[PDB]
Write a protein that binds this ligand. Sequence first.
Ligand SMILES: [Mg+2]
Ligand SMILES: [Zn+2]
Lengths: 353, 38, 312
Amino acid sequence: QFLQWCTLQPENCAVFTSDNKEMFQTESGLVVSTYSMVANTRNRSHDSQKVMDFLTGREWGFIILDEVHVVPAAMFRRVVSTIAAHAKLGLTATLVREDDKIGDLNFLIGPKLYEANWMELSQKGHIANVQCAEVWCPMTAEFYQEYLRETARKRMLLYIMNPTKFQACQFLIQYHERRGDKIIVFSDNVYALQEYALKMGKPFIYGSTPQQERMNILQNFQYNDQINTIFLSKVGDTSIDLPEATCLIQISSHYGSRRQEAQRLGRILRAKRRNDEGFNAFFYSLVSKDTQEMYYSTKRQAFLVDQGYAFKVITHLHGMENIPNLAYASPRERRELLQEVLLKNHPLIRKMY
Amino acid sequence: PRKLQDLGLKPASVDPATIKRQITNTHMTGILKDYSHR
Amino acid sequence: DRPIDDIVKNLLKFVVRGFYGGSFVLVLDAILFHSVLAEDDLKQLLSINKTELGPLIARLRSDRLISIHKQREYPPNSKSVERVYYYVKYPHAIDAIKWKVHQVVQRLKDDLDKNSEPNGYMCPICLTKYTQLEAVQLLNFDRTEFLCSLCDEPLVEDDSGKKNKEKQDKLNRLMDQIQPIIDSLKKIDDSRIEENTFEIALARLIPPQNQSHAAYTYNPKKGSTMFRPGDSAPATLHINITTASDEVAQRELQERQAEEKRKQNAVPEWHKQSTIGKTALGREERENEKTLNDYYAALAKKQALEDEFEDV
Ligand SMILES: [Mg+2]
Ligand SMILES: [Zn+2]
């Protein structure tokens, strides 16, 4: 974005990441790095140590903190003091966090300058409109029987792969795929993410994947008509641009965190076709009934309601029974899933050999 | 060709020496098409 | 093609017909009428033996009016043999012709200038030529006659004193005779000619014979880095007429597209109606016309081989 919008030459721009660490030798320039590289204090190698001396020795003028809602952390805040700058700018869509350290931003980087209302921009055609919905999926009796006995730690895994949610996710994905919508599926639980993708035969992305592979999957999901849905994880929860994304599904996510709900919603607020008449982005949150997820779900979406977005309860999806095939329809398949999830927890010598 | 240029006559030829010769999710084995550039 | 090609051909035709004998015209004309020509085909076109063809090709090659190209051929039915083809490289021939014309004119001018100088001297015995400066220092004591060094004999004045006009006549005739060459060259310089090659010449080929053994094809060896001296040189339109029936058909197709277009943005049914009270999810005129026509007719009467291939 920097190269295309402004007129800075590539000569004065240096990127300090794990791949390349060269620093611009010109009089002045830009460094687009990450908090991890600048916040590290203990183990810095020779390649990175020279960069650190270059950063510290010179007196910089400006610092930009994208997603500044994580700057007041224990050691991410060290970059503000270590790096010398006469002006500091914070840029975060969401300015809230679980702990009471949000107010600390006042003296780390300064006060709040301007806040833009979400609704006002939405009606002006600058951001897309979202029809937030919360689908209630009652767990089957067989699974719920083990729900009561199972401990909380394994309880999460128990109701994250309930058969009812599979039917809702599959039916919703197919319905939106027919409509011609680019669907993004978010799932904090890696094991659940893999289970969804392996059965559904759709690509999935999670922390272990390399940059090259995820980029290839991302490019295919955008420019190829064959693939219209992807299965993302917490990796892409922030500062990712997906203009083609219009539909979002959240089978299960990060407990009581609120910023995660809002930041993930921001992915489909990027819709390129946000000005065509009658366009409404779709944001779903499948929640199991009679489970602690309802307590978490009602708590995590407490920031969107403040902004203005309203959540609609969908007790039943019309036409869902007439779908040809559904996951774990027969009792035999359901019991097979139940057991599997329950079971989860000298050069001379060389010639001889 | 060089000799003709010395005499002022345009040579319709050139010296031949001047001519220069001139990873996860592997359950989608082949669905993923390489849309690397646009 | 191009007008310049004819001009170059005319220049070659005049040069060969004037500055060469008879058989030279036949060989060059045959290689000008056709493109690259196999040696075997050239022999039978003119019906001249190989021994007689040698002197003609050799001299023409020496003057660079004809270029040679040798390539290995692999007949499907016989052992491989090297074939020789002859063609014309216009930049080479024009370059050679330009130099030779200048040299001949320059030689006569230099010879004409030489004849204007004093005659000189020579010794009848040893046939040694002496210049005026050289003869002055060899004269005798009496200073009456020039004396030779080797022979010690009186010298004799040289000839060429009366040729002052003859050489001028020679130069006059050549310039008038050689007029068309300069005129052709002047037009050639104005335009730009593209250097010819064995492959390029084949584009204009007129086969000499019906079943010539030589294969008039250039199949360069695949990815060969070897370089030889002097062997390198510098959507369909269809139209459909739409009638009244087709016009409405297109409208119906357009209407169908418009109906489907709105669907991608249409809100689902779940979104429309609040679903809290529903269940859970999971688990005859023709005769009248004829009589009218008959009646109106009465009114008018009353009033009145298996290989890889691709589909192109
Ligand atoms: Mg951003
Ligand atoms: Zn003598």
